Structures are given as C-alpha cells and as structure tokens.
C-alpha cells in the first residue's frame, strides 16, 4: 500500500523513572526518515515510556512537558526531557509502520 494524510495525536503522561524514563529518541535526520524532528527509536524495558505501551517505535514527538519542539535543536529537546520533572508530558502523533521502518531498517536493502 501507500497510505497518507495525518491522523490524530495523543498525549503521554509518565513519571520520570529512576533511569530518567526510557525513550530512545533520535533525530529524524539521523534516521532514514531524513526528516526533521524527533522520533521514537527504542523503548527501554524497565522504563515508564515502555511501561506505557502506547509509545511505539518510530513515533514522533511534538511537545515535551508543554514545550513546543518545533525547531528546538535535538540537544535542546533532549535537555528538556533530561531536565524534565516528576511529571513528564509528551505530545506524540500516531505514525504509520513505514515511518518506523525508516527509523529501524527502512525500505530498499541498504
């Protein structure tokens, strides 16, 4: 298939664990996606992000603790989450599988 058009967004309220959450976010630029913005790459086992379930690999973050992540340098974003708080909020959008594929082994061998 192909699929297109955006869908719906969903918030994620977690509590900064003893490991500081557990969301292997990476710059879309680093991932095959080659697109700007942060995206879920992994989901630690003993983490709240994972314990959540919703958070899926490839997911794309939008906000962090009510902090618009539109232009915020990867570092800045990482910092936000890093220096987050007891209550960590994230605005991720329900992306497709393909989106993740690019994040983790995209199409076309190579």
From Swiss-Prot:
Q: Indicate the segments forming the PDZ domain, all copies.
A: 11-96
Q: In which domain of life is the source organism classified?
A: Eukaryota
Q: How does it assemble?
A: Interacts with RAP1A; in a GTP-dependent manner. Does not interact with members of the Ras family. Interacts (via PDZ domain) with KIF14; is recruited to the microtubule network restricting its interaction with activated RAP1A.
Return the similarity comment: Belongs to the RADIL family.
Task of the protein: Downstream effector of Rap required for cell adhesion and migration of neural crest precursors during development.
- The identity of this protein, by name, is Ras-associating and dilute domain-containing protein
Q: Which organism is it from?
A: Homo sapiens
Q: What is the lineage of its organism?
A: Eukaryota, Metazoa, Chordata, Craniata, Vertebrata
Name of the gene encoding the protein in the UniProt record: RADIL
């Amino acid at each position: 298939g192909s699929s297109g058009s955006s869908g719906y967004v969903f918030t994620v309220e977690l509590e900064r664990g003893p490991s500081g959450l557990g969301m292997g976010l990476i710059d879309g630029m680093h991932t095959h996606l080659g697109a700007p913005g942060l995206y879920i790459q992994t989901l630690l086992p003993g983490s709240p992000a994972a314990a959540d379930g919703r958070l899926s690999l490839g997911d794309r973050i939008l906000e962090v603790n009510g902090s618009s992540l539109l232009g915020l340098g990867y570092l800045r974003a990482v910092d936000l989450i890093r220096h987050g708080g007891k209550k960590m909020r994230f605005l991720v959008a329900k992306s497709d599988v393909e989106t993740a594929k690019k994040i983790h082994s995209g199409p076309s061998s190579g």
